[model samples]
Target chain A: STDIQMTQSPSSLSASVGDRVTITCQASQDISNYLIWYQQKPGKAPKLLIYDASNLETGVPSRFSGSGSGTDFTFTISSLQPEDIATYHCQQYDNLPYTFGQGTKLEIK
Target chain B: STDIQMTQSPSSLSASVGDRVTITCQASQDISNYLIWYQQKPGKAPKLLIYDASNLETGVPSRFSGSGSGTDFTFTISSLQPEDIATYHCQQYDNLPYTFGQGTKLEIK
Candidate 1:
């Protein structure tokens, strides 16, 4: 379980409409074989984002999409919509202790 | 993306103090090194037990401990205190699926 991944921006600022934001991951191996995505706000527990790469969890919004294969992965919020600004994280279930990416912060400009 | 873990017995019964009960995890691969343990009660969400093998989360009671590595993991309620009786589950953070084990049930004898 030594694998972990995450990268983000607009760094520490905000984003305007139609902005294309990015998050990255570096896995110990081909983790495209297993992974999940989650969203977290300042004081809340992380919420499930995507599972098994592109499979969205129970009540996540449609604009959220996950892509990539193997060692690299991305979570995208098309339109950079207002409600999408929050911390995003990646998790790989291929191993245990349920490792989570450090987290990528998203904000609105 | 097709992986899961779980094993239990005393099947549908209960355990009194000083009893040695067991729960098992059968992974699709070697997830022994990647699982975490959690406890849940009737009206509450899961509470973290063991993480990264034997690394217990903060403020958790001392009687709860985890053992096993690499695929087969176990969570034991050492003295079977009344508060220790609850459903327990195993999870992996290394894979994208982020699944929970089937869960083992514990009750007072």
Candidate 2:
């Protein structure tokens, strides 16, 4: 199995209301249109936020956006809302066995 | 963008050491599609255990196995260990949004 490392930053974050929050993920190697982002609340399943690198999932707020190309990807929350407080994760789907990042936890301060 | 639905049975389970555990997932769609399993421990990232329904991920223990095709699948731990106590989730990646299951928590009894 190929080791396509996914490095995510801001493992723990505290932001204010309406603040713009950003999380970045860097892959060890090029993995084109196969990256995805997720938002997970406590005691619930992770929800899809973005897929295929920058394509927004349906019904997701416009405030949430994703961008990137091959090795580096970004997920941003345009205006942080109280409801946006949750753990976020980025995953690589280019490999046969998908790999996920360590995850970033966000909180409103 | 995805309408795929994944439902996991036995929201919680308790078993003694050396016991066998089984979890089932039913998908609303995605016949013969990519279905994956993950194990998530508290304060940590989820680890991939199986892919494409029956294929175990590299480095995953042999005790953990997955089977079935189409919309129904099963994940089994032939011999449960204390370290296996955690939350398990199944996901369908054949769709745009890549939906996940509600998750099943395993505990030692």
Candidate 3:
């Protein structure tokens, strides 16, 4: 069983122009390019943000960026906006059963 | 962009002893084995239940089964349990823009 750990989760952040917010995920084993990031608001389905570690999904804001490799990954949002307040999740698919992070809840403080 | 439709979503049902519960998902196209299922409890991370349409994830109870193909899929729990109360979601990975269903909130009475 692969265990994916999320750090700094449920953390709050004050929102403003040019503010950078970052979320992290660490896998128990090497997950390669099978990592993905998702965003979900209260009453909405999860939206894909990054796949293959750093590849951005279509139509996603340019301020949203992802980087990292192997067993560690990071999802960063630069110049955050008010609309960016939501819970973010990271998932790994390199193993038999896909796993997701506990999720990081971002707030506009 | 793929549109995955989940029928009878967020539908509630009452359960007593050894009852069967079922949920359905329909993809906009033939996604083949790229379909996956997930379960999310309130304030918790989403858990993978089924992958490749009908294949159950490791450690998942045998009572939880999945079946369907092409554009339609089904996830069933042969015998409902108290711990099984949660929201169910279906997702497709066949296309570049992976999409998920609105989600089905399975409740017990």
Please give the clash total of every predicted structure, in order: 22, 1, 1
lDDT (Cα, tens digit) per residue for candidate 3, span A80-105: 78888888888886765677887888
| CAPRI quality band, candidate 3 | medium
Q: Find the 10 residues in a row with the least total lDDT in model 3 chain A.
A: A2-11
> Share of real interface contacts recovered by each model?
0.05, 0.74, 0.67
TM-scores of chain A across the candidates, in order, are 0.81, 0.96, 0.87
RMSD to truth, every model: 9.5, 1.5, 2.8
Query: For residues B32-61, could you state the per-residue lDDT of candidate 3 as single tens digits?
Result: 888888989876778888989988866899
Model 2 Cα shift for residue A106 (angstroms): 1.0
Prediction 1 global C-alpha lDDT: 0.65
Q: Which stretches of candidate 1 lie over 4 Å from their true place?
A: A1-13, B1-49, B52-109
In candidate 2, stretches whose alpha carbon ends up further than 4 angstroms from where it belongs are none
lDDT per residue for candidate 1 within A1-109, as digits (tens), equals 3534333222344678779776766565676557677775543334667878778876677778888778777777777877777777677656443455656677777
Candidate 1, position A69, lDDT: 78
